[PDB]
Amino acid sequence: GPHMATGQDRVVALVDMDCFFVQVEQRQNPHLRNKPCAVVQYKSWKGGGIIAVSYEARAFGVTRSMWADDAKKLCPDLLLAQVRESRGKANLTKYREASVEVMEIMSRFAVIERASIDEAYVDLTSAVQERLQKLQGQPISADLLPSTYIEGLPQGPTVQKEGMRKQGLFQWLDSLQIDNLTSPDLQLTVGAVIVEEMRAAIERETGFQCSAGISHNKVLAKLACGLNKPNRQTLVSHGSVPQLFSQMPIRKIRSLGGKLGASVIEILGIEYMGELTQFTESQLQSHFGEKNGSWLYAMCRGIEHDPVKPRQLPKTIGCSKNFPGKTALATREQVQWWLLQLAQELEERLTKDRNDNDRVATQLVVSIRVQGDKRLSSLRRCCALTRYDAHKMSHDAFTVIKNCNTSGIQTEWSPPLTMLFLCATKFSAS
DNA sequence: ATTATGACGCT
DNA sequence: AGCGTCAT
Numbered sequence: 001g002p003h004m005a006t007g008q009d010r011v012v013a014l015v016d017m018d019c020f021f022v023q024v025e026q027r028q029n030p031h032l033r034n035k036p037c038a039v040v041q042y043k044s045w046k047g048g049g050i051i052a053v054s055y056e057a058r059a060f061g062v063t064r065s066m067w068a069d070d071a072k073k074l075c076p077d078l079l080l081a082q083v084r085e086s087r088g089k090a091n092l093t094k095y096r097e098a099s100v101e102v103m104e105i106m107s108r109f110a111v112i113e114r115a116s117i118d119e120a121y122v123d124l125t126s127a128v129q130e131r132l133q134k135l136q137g138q139p140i141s142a143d144l145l146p147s148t149y150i151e152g153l154p155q156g157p158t159v160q161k162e163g164m165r166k167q168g169l170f171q172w173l174d175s176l177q178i179d180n181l182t183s184p185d186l187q188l189t190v191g192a193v194i195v196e197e198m199r200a201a202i203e204r205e206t207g208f209q210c211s212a213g214i215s216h217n218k219v220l221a222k223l224a225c226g227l228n229k230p231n232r233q234t235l236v237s238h239g240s241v242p243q244l245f246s247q248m249p250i251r252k253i254r255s256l257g258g259k260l261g262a263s264v265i266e267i268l269g270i271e272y273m274g275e276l277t278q279f280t281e282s283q284l285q286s287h288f289g290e291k292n293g294s295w296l297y298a299m300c301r302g303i304e305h306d307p308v309k310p311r312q313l314p315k316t317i318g319c320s321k322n323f324p325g326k327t328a329l330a331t332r333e334q335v336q337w338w339l340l341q342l343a344q345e346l347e348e349r350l351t352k353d354r355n356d357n358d359r360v361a362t363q364l365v366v367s368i369r370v371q372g373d374k375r376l377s378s379l380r381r382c383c384a385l386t387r388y389d390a391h392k393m394s395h396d397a398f399t400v401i402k403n404c405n406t407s408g409i410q411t412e413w414s415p416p417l418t419m420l421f422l423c424a425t426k427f428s429a430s
Numbered sequence: 431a432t433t434a435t436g437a438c439g440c441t
Numbered sequence: 442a443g444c445g446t447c448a449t
């Protein structure tokens with residue numbers, strides 16, 4: 001009734017760059033603009049592995065994880081850009097620097113949480129209140145929302161995409177009560193106005209287009225963002241949730257894309273998020289645990305409380321390389337040479353991080369995989385990181401893993417290593 | 431022979 | 442601490 005919280009206290013946005021690594025390469029090389037193209041890493045094995053795909057190329061069926069040779073079979077005119085290689089490995093520096101460009105722009109509007117190399121959540125609650133004051137009861141015109149979709153509209157009693165978008169926007173704006181500064185729907189709408197401005201600034205100042213979701217929490221904001229891509233933003237209101245969720249497969253919701261989500265489906269015998277509402281909180285907790293159960297009970301009603309954390313910088317800085325099939329490392333000299341290569345890239349990134357961000361990492365984590373293990377990581381060990389020195393770091397990494405060597409022979413390594421990983425963690429101010 | 435990352439939960 | 446899950 002009157003005491004039933006509806007999770008409508010906040011305005012949250014999720015901004016996500018469209019086909020990000022592709023746009024980085026297209027900005028740099030105009031010849032790739034408005035073409036079917038993809039970004040690939042390595043080239044020798046089947047033309048390289050695809051990691052990003054332009055919307056033009058997606059129309060031909062090109063996807064991430066596809067080998068470039070296979071992609072070319074779907075799209076013979078596909079253009080490719082290669083990830084830079086340094087010290088024998090893929091080097092993602094260019095995309096990390098492009099990411100900083102975008103994060104710094106977003107930070108002018110509001111506190112952001114960096115969720116990945118190319119996306120950030122934004123808590124717009126306070127910014128919305130401020131904009132609501134400036135407006136002073138004055139209505140919101142559709143002209144302020146030129147790329148916004150209202151999920152669930154139009155509805156009730158044109159055959160083109162932009163026409164439908166506008167019809168829905170009009171129905172929404174027609175319904176708004178702008179006299180009430182505390183209407184959640186009004187708050188979301190002002191949120192969307194601000195996000196239009198954020199997205200315009202990003203495109204103006206970097207050249208990169210993006211999509212966005214605006215809702216009352218991170219999970220709905222993320223879901224919304226994906227509903228109309230590319231180059232559009234979507235508002236998902238509290239009211240839209242029952243219909244949206246009624247046919248939404250459980251796996252589409254962030255965190256339910258894996259084993260937990262499969263267990264929800266299997267154990268409860270359901271398919272869609274909306275079907276969760278018929279279980280009690282205790283019932284959900286009995287199957288999925290206390291935390292997951294409470295989260296599910298609220299989430300299926302469109303309610304989630306996870307905060308947008310004030311964090312614009314990554315918490316760890318890591319360097320990793322696979323050594324698949326035949327290229328697995330089988331000699332001590334091999335293992336030491338590759339630890340040094342990884343340690344050298346890591347040193348370079350850490351030193352840059354220390355100058356830019358006024359902090360120093362204090363722990364080095366070392367992880368390997370051995371041939372045979374289905375798991376991505378076989379063994380992880382940490383040691384002290386006391387100096388930004390590649391030789392020391394690689395020497396230390398070797399010391400903490402050297403006992404993994406089954407080989408009776410000193411020089412040989414067995415079983416061969418199929419992955420190496422160095423990660424700097426536990427930052428302190430400096 | 432996807433690969434290179436990165437956050438957070440469990441015990 | 443070391444491992445697993447989920448994500449981009």
Ligand SMILES: Nc1ncnc2c1ncn2[C@H]1C[C@H](O)[C@@H](COP(=O)(O)OP(=O)(O)OP(=O)(O)O)O1
Nearest residue numbers: 016017018019020021022051052053117118229449
């Ligand atoms: N599995 C992966 N392996 C390596 N790099 C990845 C992987 N997934 C994503 N990336 C990189 C390349 C992407 O351009 C970038 C952002 O990822 P993501 O947001 O999932 O897709 P995207 O930006 O390429 O397309 P979209 O327009 O659908 O968001 O991070």
Ligand SMILES: [Ca+2]
Nearest residue numbers: 016017018019
């Ligand atoms: Ca993206």
Ligand code: NA
Nearest residue numbers: 016116118119
């Ligand atoms: Na993303």
